[PDB]
Predict the structure of endothiapepsin.
Amino acid sequence: STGSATTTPIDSLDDAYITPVQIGTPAQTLNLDFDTGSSDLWVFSSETTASEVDGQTIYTPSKSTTAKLLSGATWSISYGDGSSSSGDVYTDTVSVGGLTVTGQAVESAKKVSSSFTEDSTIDGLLGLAFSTLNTVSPTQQKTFFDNAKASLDSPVFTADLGYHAPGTYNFGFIDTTAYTGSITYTAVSTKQGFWEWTSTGYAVGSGTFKSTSIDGIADTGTTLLYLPATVVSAYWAQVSGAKSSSSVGGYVFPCSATLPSFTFGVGSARIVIPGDYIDFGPISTGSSSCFGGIQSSAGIGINIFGDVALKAAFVVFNGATTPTLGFASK
């Protein structure tokens, strides 16, 4: 089998991407944030504290003839950005772009933190990291990809995120028309439950490539590119007027600037992030100070190749017996 679904930016800045997902019988379609940095499929629901719902579409398990309460199961998750959610668990039928999993754990939110409430465009998350990170207790549950894997034509999914435009998640096949050149594959460590790999270095604009190992994760659920302070300083030094602002919480730059590109290495291959991808607009409405899309990972504890990086590539998440990651230009 295979599946193919379009993923759409939630706003004009590409702050996140939503993908429609069919849950239950009859289908209830929710727009979920596909997140290769976590491993829970959770949704706003009829069980969510009413004051914590503000425009999201909810899953109502009592209206699904295939929903079954997973007895005694609860979940609770806290994300790197400080947000959180928790609740109970159903199993139900879940389909993505024509690909169907029966008996998928659907984690129904009883509580969500303020940032989720405040974002009416995201109805939940669909985790695509390794199932070892799944928070369901007392019996850990599998991700949608893990449940589908054996049935897929090939045990892979691909992320093709757009810049200020829709893109595609495919399951079970590689669309060879969706990229240029070849796909370069690189080793993955699953030891922390992430799609963790090592970049071979970077360049800033037309500058010389610096060969240096950068360990980080391929994370579709993180907006920006988080890299070591040395690397980030080298980038923003090329932008007149850019500075790190403690009050704003990162590097800002004059909105009048033209940003240089940023290149990262995948083995001997090179992925080029155009400068415009690194502009996340005024820090506050009407400001001429703009927020940077490359920020320091210092104090995160890990480097994160988020959407700013991934949308510059066609990315293969290879779930073979020994997982690997593939990157192509596009």
Remarks:
- The chain is about 5% helix and 45% strand.
